[PDB]
C-alpha cells in the first residue's frame, strides 16, 4: 500500500544509502513499490537495486514524482534548494535543534503541505532510538585516529594524512589501518595508548571494536564514561595519551576536557584527537582546539601548538560514511520494522510520534 522513493545523496562524498538492496528486496516482499535514483555517490550500485526489484529512476527525479510517493534519503538536501516540499519525507533534516536556517527548511514543508518524519527522532515505545549510526561513527573514527598516529611515525611533520576513500567493506578498512599501524610499529614507535571518552555507548563500542581488530593491546585502552568525566576537566590523561577519541556530545558551560594551555607542553605525548561528536557550531565545545570540520579529501587539521610534538584533529561529521556499506546495512536493518509499519503510519506510534514533532516544530515558525 506504499510507494518508497530512494533519493540520491548530494552532500559531498556521502556514500551511504537509507535503503540497501537487501532492505529494498524485503520491502518489495511485504508489498511495497520502490523507486531508486541512480546515484553516482552511493556505495551501492544500480545493478544491486535492480536485482532487488527496484525500479531505477534518474538522480533528482523525486522532485517531480507523484505526491503519494514517500521520499527517503539520509542527509540534508542542497542549501541552494528552495521549492515547496510537497511529499512525505523520511530523512535526517537537522532543523529541530535550532540549527542555522531551520525555519527556512520548515517553511518548505509548510508551504508545500509536506511532512517530515525525522530519522534522528524515530523512537520505540520505551523512548529508545530505532536506528542510529553511533557504532560505525566510533569504528570509522578509531580507524582514522590510528592511521593518523601511524602516519606521524612514518612521515615528516611537513606532510599530513592524505585524502581517504570510503572503504568498500570492513575487510578493506581493517587491512588498510593494520598495514599503517604495523609500518608505524616498524619504526620502533611505542605501541600507542588510547583514551576513549564515552567508551560505554554505541560510538565507544565501535571505537573499541576497531582497536581490537587492528591489534592494539586492550591494556593500552583507557575507557572513560560518566564515572570519570563527572570529576570535571581539564584531564591530564588526554595529553598523556597517544590518541584521544571523544564520543560524547557536550555543550554545557562546564570545564573543557582539555585546552590549548594544557596542550602547549614539550612533555605532551598526544598525537591525534578524533572528535566523533565534533560540531563547529557548538557554543561550549569541551575540546576547544579546532575550528574546522575536516572531510574525507582532507581528513586532518593541525592543532597550532606552541610546544610538544605535532598534534592533529579529525572532525569529520559523517564518519559512518567511511564504511558506508556496513553502516547502511545495519542502519537500514534496524529501521526496517518501522518501515514495514508505513502502510498504517496514521496509527503506528513510531510514525505518529514523529509526525507530532514535525507539527510541534512547524508551530514554532
Ligand atoms: Cl553489480
CSV table of N, CA and C in Angstrom, one decimal, residues 219-329:
chain,number,residue,atom,x,y,z
A,219,UNK,N,45.0,-3.5,27.1
A,219,UNK,CA,45.6,-2.9,28.2
A,219,UNK,C,46.0,-1.4,27.9
A,220,UNK,N,46.1,-1.1,26.6
A,220,UNK,CA,46.5,0.2,26.2
A,220,UNK,C,45.3,1.2,25.9
A,221,UNK,N,44.1,0.7,26.2
A,221,UNK,CA,42.9,1.5,26.0
A,221,UNK,C,42.2,1.9,27.4
A,222,UNK,N,42.3,3.2,27.6
A,222,UNK,CA,41.7,3.8,28.8
A,222,UNK,C,40.2,4.2,28.5
A,223,UNK,N,39.3,3.5,29.2
A,223,UNK,CA,37.9,3.5,28.8
A,223,UNK,C,37.1,4.4,29.8
A,224,UNK,N,36.7,5.6,29.4
A,224,UNK,CA,36.1,6.6,30.3
A,224,UNK,C,34.6,6.8,29.9
A,225,UNK,N,33.8,7.0,30.9
A,225,UNK,CA,32.4,7.5,30.7
A,225,UNK,C,32.0,8.5,31.7
A,226,UNK,N,30.7,8.5,32.1
A,226,UNK,CA,30.2,9.4,33.2
A,226,UNK,C,31.0,9.3,34.5
A,227,UNK,N,31.2,8.1,35.0
A,227,UNK,CA,32.0,8.0,36.3
A,227,UNK,C,33.3,8.9,36.3
A,228,UNK,N,34.0,8.9,35.2
A,228,UNK,CA,35.3,9.6,35.1
A,228,UNK,C,35.2,11.1,34.7
A,229,UNK,N,34.3,11.4,33.8
A,229,UNK,CA,34.1,12.8,33.3
A,229,UNK,C,33.4,13.7,34.3
A,230,UNK,N,32.5,13.1,35.1
A,230,UNK,CA,31.8,13.9,36.1
A,230,UNK,C,32.7,14.6,37.1
A,231,UNK,N,33.9,14.1,37.3
A,231,UNK,CA,35.0,14.8,38.0
A,231,UNK,C,35.3,16.2,37.5
A,232,UNK,N,35.2,16.4,36.2
A,232,UNK,CA,35.3,17.8,35.6
A,232,UNK,C,36.8,18.0,35.1
A,233,UNK,N,36.9,18.7,34.0
A,233,UNK,CA,38.2,18.9,33.3
A,233,UNK,C,38.9,20.1,33.8
A,234,UNK,N,40.1,20.4,33.1
A,234,UNK,CA,40.8,19.6,32.1
A,234,UNK,C,41.5,18.3,32.6
A,235,UNK,N,41.5,17.2,31.8
A,235,UNK,CA,42.1,16.0,32.3
A,235,UNK,C,43.5,15.8,31.8
A,236,UNK,N,44.5,15.6,32.7
A,236,UNK,CA,45.9,15.3,32.4
A,236,UNK,C,46.1,14.1,31.5
A,237,UNK,N,45.2,13.2,31.6
A,237,UNK,CA,45.2,11.9,30.9
A,237,UNK,C,45.1,12.1,29.3
A,238,UNK,N,44.4,13.2,28.9
A,238,UNK,CA,44.3,13.5,27.5
A,238,UNK,C,45.7,13.8,26.8
A,239,UNK,N,46.5,14.8,27.3
A,239,UNK,CA,47.8,15.0,26.7
A,239,UNK,C,48.8,13.8,26.9
A,240,UNK,N,48.6,13.0,27.9
A,240,UNK,CA,49.4,11.9,28.3
A,240,UNK,C,49.2,10.7,27.4
A,241,UNK,N,48.0,10.6,26.8
A,241,UNK,CA,47.7,9.6,25.8
A,241,UNK,C,48.3,9.8,24.5
A,242,UNK,N,48.4,8.7,23.7
A,242,UNK,CA,48.9,8.9,22.3
A,242,UNK,C,47.8,9.4,21.3
A,243,UNK,N,46.6,8.8,21.5
A,243,UNK,CA,45.4,9.0,20.7
A,243,UNK,C,44.3,9.3,21.7
A,244,UNK,N,43.4,10.3,21.4
A,244,UNK,CA,42.2,10.5,22.2
A,244,UNK,C,41.0,10.6,21.3
A,245,UNK,N,40.0,9.7,21.6
A,245,UNK,CA,38.8,9.5,20.8
A,245,UNK,C,37.7,10.0,21.8
A,246,UNK,N,37.0,11.1,21.4
A,246,UNK,CA,35.8,11.6,22.1
A,246,UNK,C,34.5,11.1,21.4
A,247,UNK,N,33.6,10.5,22.1
A,247,UNK,CA,32.3,10.0,21.7
A,247,UNK,C,31.1,10.8,22.3
A,248,UNK,N,31.4,11.8,23.2
A,248,UNK,CA,30.4,12.5,23.9
A,248,UNK,C,30.1,13.8,23.4
A,249,UNK,N,28.8,14.1,23.0
A,249,UNK,CA,28.4,15.4,22.7
A,249,UNK,C,28.0,16.2,23.9
A,250,UNK,N,28.8,17.3,24.2
A,250,UNK,CA,28.5,18.1,25.4
A,250,UNK,C,28.6,19.6,25.0
A,251,UNK,N,27.7,20.4,25.5
A,251,UNK,CA,27.6,21.8,25.2
A,251,UNK,C,27.2,22.7,26.4
A,252,UNK,N,27.5,22.2,27.6
A,252,UNK,CA,27.2,23.0,28.8
A,252,UNK,C,28.4,23.9,29.1
A,253,UNK,N,28.2,25.1,29.7
A,253,UNK,CA,29.3,25.9,30.1
A,253,UNK,C,30.1,25.4,31.3
A,254,UNK,N,30.6,24.1,31.1
A,254,UNK,CA,31.4,23.4,32.0
A,254,UNK,C,32.9,23.5,31.7
A,255,UNK,N,33.7,23.0,32.6
A,255,UNK,CA,35.2,22.9,32.3
A,255,UNK,C,35.4,22.0,31.1
A,256,UNK,N,36.3,22.4,30.2
A,256,UNK,CA,36.6,21.6,29.0
A,256,UNK,C,37.4,20.4,29.3
A,257,UNK,N,37.4,19.4,28.5
A,257,UNK,CA,38.2,18.1,28.6
A,257,UNK,C,39.7,18.4,28.6
A,258,UNK,N,40.1,19.3,27.7
A,258,UNK,CA,41.5,19.8,27.5
A,258,UNK,C,41.4,21.2,26.9
A,259,UNK,N,42.5,21.8,26.8
A,259,UNK,CA,42.6,23.2,26.2
A,259,UNK,C,44.0,23.4,25.6
A,260,UNK,N,44.2,24.6,24.9
A,260,UNK,CA,45.5,24.9,24.3
A,260,UNK,C,46.6,25.0,25.3
A,261,UNK,N,46.3,25.7,26.5
A,261,UNK,CA,47.2,25.8,27.6
A,261,UNK,C,47.8,24.5,28.0
A,262,UNK,N,46.9,23.5,28.3
A,262,UNK,CA,47.4,22.1,28.7
A,262,UNK,C,48.1,21.4,27.5
A,263,UNK,N,47.7,21.7,26.3
A,263,UNK,CA,48.4,21.0,25.2
A,263,UNK,C,49.7,21.6,24.8
A,264,UNK,N,49.9,22.9,25.2
A,264,UNK,CA,51.2,23.6,24.9
A,264,UNK,C,52.2,23.1,26.0
A,265,UNK,N,52.9,22.0,25.7
A,265,UNK,CA,53.8,21.4,26.7
A,265,UNK,C,54.7,20.5,26.0
A,266,UNK,N,56.1,20.7,26.2
A,266,UNK,CA,57.0,19.8,25.4
A,266,UNK,C,56.9,18.3,25.8
A,267,UNK,N,56.3,18.0,27.0
A,267,UNK,CA,56.1,16.7,27.5
A,267,UNK,C,54.9,15.9,27.1
A,268,UNK,N,54.1,16.6,26.2
A,268,UNK,CA,52.8,16.0,25.8
A,268,UNK,C,53.1,14.9,24.9
A,269,UNK,N,52.4,13.8,25.0
A,269,UNK,CA,52.5,12.6,24.1
A,269,UNK,C,51.4,12.6,23.0
A,270,UNK,N,50.3,13.3,23.3
A,270,UNK,CA,49.1,13.2,22.4
A,270,UNK,C,49.5,13.6,21.0
A,271,UNK,N,49.1,12.7,20.0
A,271,UNK,CA,49.4,13.0,18.6
A,271,UNK,C,48.2,13.2,17.8
A,272,UNK,N,47.1,12.6,18.2
A,272,UNK,CA,45.9,12.5,17.4
A,272,UNK,C,44.6,12.7,18.3
A,273,UNK,N,43.7,13.6,17.9
A,273,UNK,CA,42.4,13.7,18.5
A,273,UNK,C,41.3,13.4,17.5
A,274,UNK,N,40.4,12.4,17.8
A,274,UNK,CA,39.3,12.1,17.0
A,274,UNK,C,38.1,12.6,17.7
A,275,UNK,N,37.5,13.7,17.3
A,275,UNK,CA,36.2,14.2,18.0
A,275,UNK,C,35.1,13.7,17.1
A,276,UNK,N,34.6,12.5,17.4
A,276,UNK,CA,33.4,11.9,16.8
A,276,UNK,C,32.2,12.8,16.9
A,277,UNK,N,32.1,13.6,18.0
A,277,UNK,CA,31.0,14.5,18.3
A,277,UNK,C,31.1,15.9,17.7
A,278,UNK,N,32.2,16.1,16.9
A,278,UNK,CA,32.6,17.4,16.5
A,278,UNK,C,31.5,18.1,15.8
A,279,UNK,N,31.3,19.4,16.2
A,279,UNK,CA,30.3,20.3,15.6
A,279,UNK,C,30.9,21.7,15.8
A,280,UNK,N,31.3,22.3,14.8
A,280,UNK,CA,31.9,23.6,14.8
A,280,UNK,C,31.0,24.8,15.3
A,281,UNK,N,29.7,24.5,15.3
A,281,UNK,CA,28.7,25.5,15.8
A,281,UNK,C,28.4,25.3,17.3
A,282,UNK,N,29.0,24.3,17.9
A,282,UNK,CA,28.9,24.1,19.4
A,282,UNK,C,29.4,25.3,20.1
A,283,UNK,N,28.5,26.0,20.9
A,283,UNK,CA,28.9,27.2,21.6
A,283,UNK,C,29.9,26.9,22.8
A,284,UNK,N,29.9,25.7,23.4
A,284,UNK,CA,30.7,25.4,24.5
A,284,UNK,C,31.4,24.0,24.2
A,285,UNK,N,32.3,24.1,23.3
A,285,UNK,CA,33.0,22.8,22.9
A,285,UNK,C,34.0,22.3,23.9
A,286,UNK,N,33.8,21.1,24.5
A,286,UNK,CA,34.7,20.6,25.5
A,286,UNK,C,36.1,20.3,25.0
A,287,UNK,N,36.3,20.4,23.7
A,287,UNK,CA,37.6,20.1,23.0
A,287,UNK,C,37.9,21.4,22.1
A,288,UNK,N,38.2,22.5,22.8
A,288,UNK,CA,38.4,23.8,22.0
A,288,UNK,C,39.7,24.0,21.4
A,289,UNK,N,40.1,23.2,20.4
A,289,UNK,CA,41.4,23.1,19.8
A,289,UNK,C,41.3,23.1,18.3
A,290,UNK,N,40.1,23.3,17.8
A,290,UNK,CA,39.8,23.3,16.4
A,290,UNK,C,38.6,24.1,16.0
A,291,UNK,N,38.6,24.6,14.8
A,291,UNK,CA,37.6,25.5,14.2
A,291,UNK,C,37.1,24.9,12.8
A,292,UNK,N,37.7,23.8,12.3
A,292,UNK,CA,37.4,23.3,11.0
A,292,UNK,C,36.7,21.9,11.2
A,293,UNK,N,35.7,21.6,10.4
A,293,UNK,CA,35.2,20.2,10.3
A,293,UNK,C,35.9,19.6,9.1
A,294,UNK,N,36.8,18.6,9.4
A,294,UNK,CA,37.6,18.0,8.3
A,294,UNK,C,36.7,17.1,7.5
A,295,UNK,N,37.2,16.7,6.3
A,295,UNK,CA,36.4,16.0,5.3
A,295,UNK,C,37.3,14.8,4.8
A,296,UNK,N,36.6,13.8,4.1
A,296,UNK,CA,37.5,12.7,3.6
A,296,UNK,C,38.6,13.1,2.7
A,297,UNK,N,38.5,14.1,1.8
A,297,UNK,CA,39.5,14.6,0.9
A,297,UNK,C,40.7,15.3,1.6
A,298,UNK,N,40.5,15.7,2.9
A,298,UNK,CA,41.4,16.5,3.7
A,298,UNK,C,41.1,16.2,5.2
A,299,UNK,N,41.4,14.9,5.7
A,299,UNK,CA,40.7,14.4,6.9
A,299,UNK,C,41.2,14.9,8.2
A,300,UNK,N,42.4,15.6,8.2
A,300,UNK,CA,43.0,16.1,9.5
A,300,UNK,C,43.3,17.6,9.4
A,301,UNK,N,43.3,18.2,10.5
A,301,UNK,CA,43.7,19.6,10.6
A,301,UNK,C,44.6,19.8,11.8
A,302,UNK,N,45.7,20.6,11.6
A,302,UNK,CA,46.7,20.9,12.6
A,302,UNK,C,46.1,21.6,13.8
A,303,UNK,N,46.5,21.1,15.0
A,303,UNK,CA,46.3,21.9,16.2
A,303,UNK,C,47.6,22.7,16.4
A,304,UNK,N,47.4,24.1,16.5
A,304,UNK,CA,48.5,25.0,16.4
A,304,UNK,C,49.2,25.2,17.8
A,305,UNK,N,49.8,24.1,18.2
A,305,UNK,CA,50.5,24.0,19.5
A,305,UNK,C,51.8,24.8,19.4
A,306,UNK,N,52.2,25.4,20.5
A,306,UNK,CA,53.5,26.1,20.6
A,306,UNK,C,54.6,25.3,21.3
A,307,UNK,N,54.2,24.2,21.9
A,307,UNK,CA,55.2,23.2,22.5
A,307,UNK,C,54.7,21.8,22.3
A,308,UNK,N,55.6,20.8,22.3
A,308,UNK,CA,55.2,19.4,22.1
A,308,UNK,C,55.3,19.0,20.6
A,309,UNK,N,55.1,17.7,20.4
A,309,UNK,CA,55.1,17.1,19.0
A,309,UNK,C,53.8,17.5,18.2
A,310,UNK,N,53.9,17.3,16.9
A,310,UNK,CA,52.8,17.6,16.1
A,310,UNK,C,51.5,16.9,16.5
A,311,UNK,N,50.4,17.7,16.6
A,311,UNK,CA,49.1,17.2,17.0
A,311,UNK,C,48.1,17.6,15.9
A,312,UNK,N,47.3,16.6,15.6
A,312,UNK,CA,46.2,16.9,14.6
A,312,UNK,C,44.8,16.5,15.2
A,313,UNK,N,43.8,17.1,14.6
A,313,UNK,CA,42.4,16.8,14.9
A,313,UNK,C,41.7,16.2,13.6
A,314,UNK,N,40.8,15.2,13.9
A,314,UNK,CA,39.9,14.6,12.9
A,314,UNK,C,38.5,15.0,13.4
A,315,UNK,N,37.7,15.7,12.6
A,315,UNK,CA,36.5,16.3,13.0
A,315,UNK,C,35.4,16.2,11.9
A,316,UNK,N,35.5,15.1,11.1
A,316,UNK,CA,34.5,14.7,10.1
A,316,UNK,C,33.1,14.4,10.8
A,317,UNK,N,32.1,15.1,10.2
A,317,UNK,CA,30.7,15.0,10.9
A,317,UNK,C,29.9,13.8,10.3
A,318,UNK,N,30.4,13.0,9.4
A,318,UNK,CA,29.7,11.9,8.8
A,318,UNK,C,30.6,10.7,8.7
A,319,UNK,N,31.4,10.4,9.8
A,319,UNK,CA,32.3,9.3,9.9
A,319,UNK,C,31.8,8.0,9.4
A,320,UNK,N,30.5,7.6,9.7
A,320,UNK,CA,30.0,6.2,9.2
A,320,UNK,C,30.1,6.1,7.7
A,321,UNK,N,30.1,7.2,7.0
A,321,UNK,CA,30.3,7.1,5.6
A,321,UNK,C,31.7,6.7,5.2
A,322,UNK,N,32.6,6.5,6.1
A,322,UNK,CA,33.9,5.9,5.8
A,322,UNK,C,33.8,4.4,5.6
A,323,UNK,N,32.7,3.8,6.1
A,323,UNK,CA,32.4,2.3,5.9
A,323,UNK,C,30.9,2.3,5.5
A,324,UNK,N,30.6,2.8,4.3
A,324,UNK,CA,29.3,3.1,4.0
A,324,UNK,C,28.4,1.9,3.8
A,325,UNK,N,28.9,0.8,3.3
A,325,UNK,CA,28.2,-0.4,3.1
A,325,UNK,C,27.6,-1.0,4.4
A,326,UNK,N,28.5,-1.5,5.3
A,326,UNK,CA,28.2,-2.0,6.6
A,326,UNK,C,27.3,-0.9,7.3
A,327,UNK,N,27.7,0.3,7.3
A,327,UNK,CA,26.9,1.3,8.2
A,327,UNK,C,25.4,1.4,7.7
A,328,UNK,N,25.2,1.4,6.4
A,328,UNK,CA,23.9,1.5,5.7
A,328,UNK,C,23.2,0.2,6.0
A,329,UNK,N,23.9,-1.0,5.8
A,329,UNK,CA,23.2,-2.3,6.1
A,329,UNK,C,22.6,-2.4,7.5
